[PDB]
């Protein structure tokens, strides 16, 4: 099965191996045991080129894993701003909610990726979105004392 | 001769001991090298004599660190003390009672006992020991209580008198000082026959207004403390009729062995800058002995009852002036004694004026008086300590520092219970 090979080729960042497996019929939307797609692992490990070649060959930009994490969730969490913009331009749900109530704005705010926060707000991120604990991205900024993030959310 | 051995534990005990022995030599006319030109009687209770006419104090200086005692080894009285009587460790108890009692203190206690035994072997008839130590220090509380326990075994018949430094926040160096104070009081209670507390706050305040010292330091406090301690031990080093030995201290001031904390009051305390002050009369200094602001421990004897009261005068004091001044106190002021005690004032007069130390903040006085009284109002000082103990112990704060140095946590409650019984002991006497 070439799905497990494409999964690890997308994680390791082997662009040439991703293009070869795709031509050999590898499941682009294959999932590991956690439900992670090659687009998930590509967006997690900062492989922008593999992210683009995946979306160009039928990758579900809004695929969710077992915990409901989208590639935008992980890209905003790890802080790959370039992958975040590419995912958003390909139809990524900016307000996707995972199993913990977190939106891509929540993870970008918690991790201090202020530039990703500004891009998510520009693309329609719901500031009123609450996690499972009743906290919004603005609530996290106040609770953590992150004044720089609070001013960004106030625009 | 009925000799007395002084023991100075910790920094407070050593520094105050250094000020006391400086004052003793000045009172007895002893040069810093130990030579006294005016004969070489009664001063022998505190000083031994060598073949070369050198008078060595019967003093032991013990500290778990050498910094403070090295000042005595390289001070003005470097040649005065026996060099082997200056015992130092390398690591202090860190403000931990358990360190000075259970761990670090055990590494030097047997050496301290052997050096004390060497001094006791030079005594014809040892009275006992005067122990100088702090309440809040790890050594002054931990090692002292351990030393008091050991002295009770090797010298069961000898008397043990304490000069204790009550903690005060203005000069305090540790937050666990209420712990160390309560822990050392419970373990020393049965091993001490008489303990003169020195409230650092009372001495601090007297230095502030009575001496016009803005920020008093240990030097200012120790010079005043040594003035009071010398007034208490003057009867042991001079001829007299009141408190001639350590046994009389318990007989006159200690009706029950548990309530052995007499309140000391000294008067007058005049700044040296007012050298031309008018000489205060016997009645004025005697009335100042009942003013709460002249006392060594912050309390209100008007709120308590007297079980004993000794008046030790120094200087131009005619005994008929004491009786007249005492007859006015008994009549004018409502000074209530306990019903089971003679409503009387024991009076001892040393007709030599008090000696002022050069460099001190005290002025020369023609007459002074130190009042030793056992009043139930000193339980207020215990209450202030026990409250600070209860506030911290309720949350078990800083307790881990003590259990980590070979001390079970039950000793905290066992010491706190004994203090609750001590406060109760003051209640059954005066209601």
């Amino acid at each position: 099965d070439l799905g497990k090979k494409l999964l690890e080729a997308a994680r390791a960042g082997q662009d040439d191996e991703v293009r070869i497996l795709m031509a050999n019929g590898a499941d682009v939307n294959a999932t590991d045991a956690s439900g992670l797609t090659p687009l998930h692992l590509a967006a997690t490990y900062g492989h922008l080129e593999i992210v683009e070649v995946l979306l160009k060959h039928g990758a579900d930009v809004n695929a969710i894993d077992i915990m409901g994490s989208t590639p935008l969730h992980l890209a905003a969490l790890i802080g790959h701003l370039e992958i975040v913009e590419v995912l958003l331009k390909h139809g990524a749900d900016v307000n996707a909610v995972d199993t913990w109530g977190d939106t891509p704005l929540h993870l970008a705010a918690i991790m201090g990726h202020l530039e990703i926060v500004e891009v998510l707000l520009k693309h329609g991120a719901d500031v009123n979105a609450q996690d499972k604990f009743g906290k919004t991205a603005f609530d996290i900024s106040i609770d953590n004392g992150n004044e720089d993030l609070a001013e960004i959310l106030q625009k | 001769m009925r000799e007395c051995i002084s023991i100075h534990v910790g920094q407070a005990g050593v520094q105050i001991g250094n000020a006391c022995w400086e004052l003793y030599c000045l009172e007895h006319g002893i040069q810093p090298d130990g030579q006294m030109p005016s004969d070489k009687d009664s001063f022998n209770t505190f000083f031994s004599e060598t073949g070369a006419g050198k008078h060595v104090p019967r003093a032991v200086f013990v500290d778990l660190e050498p910094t403070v005692i090295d000042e005595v080894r390289t001070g003005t009285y470097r040649q005065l003390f026996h060099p082997e009587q200056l015992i130092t460790g390398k690591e202090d108890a860190a403000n931990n009672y358990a360190r000075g009692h259970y761990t670090i203190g055990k590494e030097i206690i047997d050496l301290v006992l052997d050096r004390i035994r060497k001094l006791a072997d030079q005594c014809t008839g040892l009275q006992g020991f005067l122990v100088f130590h702090s309440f809040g220090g790890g050594t002054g509380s931990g090692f002292t209580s351990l030393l008091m326990e050991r002295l009770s075994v090797d010298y069961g018949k000898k008397s043990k008198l304490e000069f204790s430094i009550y903690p005060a926040p203005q000069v305090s160096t540790a937050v666990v000082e209420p712990y160390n104070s309560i822990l050392t009081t419970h373990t020393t209670l049965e091993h001490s026959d008489c303990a003169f507390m020195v409230d650092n706050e009372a001495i601090y305040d007297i230095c502030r207004r009575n001496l016009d010292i803005e920020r008093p330091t240990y030097t200012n406090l120790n010079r005043l403390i040594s003035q009071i301690v010398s007034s208490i031990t003057a009867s042991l080093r001079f001829d007299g009729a009141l408190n001639v030995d350590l046994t009389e201290f318990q007989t006159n001031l200690v009706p029950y062995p548990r309530i052995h904390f007499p309140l000391a009051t000294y008067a007058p305390v005049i700044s040296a800058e007012k050298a031309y002050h008018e000489q205060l009369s016997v009645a004025e200094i005697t009335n100042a002995c009942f003013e709460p602001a002249n006392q060594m421990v912050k309390c209100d004897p008007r709120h308590g009852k007297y079980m004993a009261c000794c008046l030790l005068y120094r200087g131009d004091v005619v005994p008929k002036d004491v009786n007249a001044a005492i007859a006015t106190i008994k009549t004018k002021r409502s000074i209530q004694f306990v019903d089971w005690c003679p409503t009387g004032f024991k009076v001892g007069i040393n007709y030599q004026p008090p000696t002022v130390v050069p460099g001190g903040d005290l002025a020369k006085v023609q007459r002074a008086v130190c009042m030793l009284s056992n009043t139930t109002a000193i339980a207020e000082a215990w209450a202030r300590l026990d409250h600070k103990f209860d506030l911290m112990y309720a949350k078990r704060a800083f307790v881990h520092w003590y259990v980590g140095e070979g001390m079970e946590e039950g000793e905290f409650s066992e010491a706190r219970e004994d203090m609750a019984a001590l406060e109760k002991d003051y209640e059954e006497v005066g209601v």
Partner: protein
């Protein structure tokens, strides 16, 4: 209690550690060659605390420089005092850790940690009265965090009675946007809770905020942050390098500042806040220095003290100033902000005054506080950790080095209990 063995692990540990030696050597009058060049006796009174006297008035810093990548080997020598470090104390590895906490704690760092313990033993056995160890390191990396905590555990197992002090640098996305740093910090904090006696929380989040907002530095560099660190490390260690009575050693400071074993993470503060290359007439008054020490914009950790309660506080004042004025301003802030101090620990604020101010300053004020508000710092790292751990992001980097996944949950559980402990004592009343 005199000599301290300094250790610096990782890039940040050696960077802020070299700045520590550069700052205190200037205060002690020690030039990079190791000779004395000052004109004050207080600079040697306790010079053996951090320096070893070598040959011909040469003071070699008792420091050990550790790292996994050899790039920092030439980085310290490129500095001013790079030649003052002993070449024997340079224990560096072949390959770095790459921000992998497991690489420093289990694989690469564990392979080289035995070589560091050899130099630690060589410096410790050359100590007359070693009081403990101090370690500068960051928590976000792999060497200073993963191996630093391993060095702490192995040194504690070898010297259990010694004080384990650390200058730990908390990570922040404002300074380094590396997402695995919450992993390394949480695993390190789990180790610091069990194996250190005193930890100075130097939060990079607060360092960036002071430079960006207060100092008005648009682009603050590591030198701008380390300027605040070196000023803090010099202030918090003032009582250890100069003659004093309060907190003069690592254990007495720990006994006074650590009421509970796990709550040993201090919030340091410095006043006045100054940037390098731009110092101006400070002329800060004692009340201005007092109000700034307890201000949140002056805290080295991004925590609002007004949101928590002070368990213990040690204030250090440097420079020539009125001792009485410091006592009044200290008692005034405690009166004005009475609700911000725990009531069940009386006299929990301790004040020390040193006559030697730091470089380029006439008046200085250093704050050392054990505040329950430090949970805000731990909660921020916990939320960043939980955000990463719930998605299992980059978890293979750690488990690939033989590290168990349950160690992540155990570290997160322990830090969550630490936050719960601070909140528990934040809500406790005297009743």
């Amino acid at each position: 209690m005199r000599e301290i063995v300094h250790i610096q692990a990782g890039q940040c540990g050696n960077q802020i550690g070299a700045k520590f030696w550069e700052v205190i050597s200037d205060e002690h009058g020690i030039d990079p060659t190791g000779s004395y060049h000052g004109d004050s006796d207080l600079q040697l009174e306790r010079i053996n605390v951090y320096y070893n006297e070598a040959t011909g008035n040469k003071y070699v810093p008792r420091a050990i420089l550790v790292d996994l990548e050899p790039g920092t080997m030439d980085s310290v020598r490129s500095g001013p005092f790079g030649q003052i470090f002993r070449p024997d104390n340079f224990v560096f590895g072949q390959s770095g850790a790459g921000n992998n906490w497991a690489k420093g704690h289990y694989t690469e760092g564990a392979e080289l940690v035995d070589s560091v313990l050899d130099v630690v033993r060589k410096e410790s056995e050359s100590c007359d009265c070693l009081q403990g160890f101090q370690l500068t390191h960051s928590l976000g990396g792999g060497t200073g965090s993963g191996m630093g905590t391993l060095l702490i555990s192995k040194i504690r197992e070898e010297y259990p009675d010694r004080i384990m002090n650390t200058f730990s640098v908390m990570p922040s996305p404002k300074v380094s946007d590396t997402v695995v740093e919450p992993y390394n910090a949480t695993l390190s904090v789990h180790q610091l809770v069990e194996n250190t006696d005193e930890t100075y929380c130097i939060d990079n989040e607060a360092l960036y905020d002071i430079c960006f907002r207060t100092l008005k530095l648009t682009t603050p560099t590591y030198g701008d942050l380390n300027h605040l660190v070196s000023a803090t490390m010099s202030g918090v260690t003032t009582c250890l390098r100069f003659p004093g009575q309060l907190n003069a050693d690592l254990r007495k400071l720990a006994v006074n500042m650590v009421p509970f074993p796990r709550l040993h993470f201090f919030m340091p503060g410095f006043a006045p806040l100054t940037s390098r290359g731009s110092q101006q007439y400070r002329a800060l008054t004692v009340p201005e220095l007092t109000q700034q020490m307890f201000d949140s914009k002056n805290m080295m950790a991004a925590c609002d003290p007004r949101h928590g309660r002070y368990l213990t506080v040690a204030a250090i004042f440097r420079g020539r100033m009125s001792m009485k004025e410091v006592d009044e301003q200290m008692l005034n802030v405690q009166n004005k902000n009475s609700s911000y101090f725990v009531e069940w620990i009386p006299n929990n604020v301790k004040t020390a005054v040193c006559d030697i101010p730091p470089r380029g300053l006439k008046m200085s004020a250093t704050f050392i506080g054990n505040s329950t508000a430090i949970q805000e710092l731990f909660k921020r790292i916990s939320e960043q950790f939980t955000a990463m751990f719930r998605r299992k992001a980059f978890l293979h980097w750690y488990t690939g080095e033989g590290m168990d996944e349950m160690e992540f949950t155990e570290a997160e559980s322990n830090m969550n209990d630490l936050v719960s402990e601070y909140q528990q004592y934040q809500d406790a009343t005297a009743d």
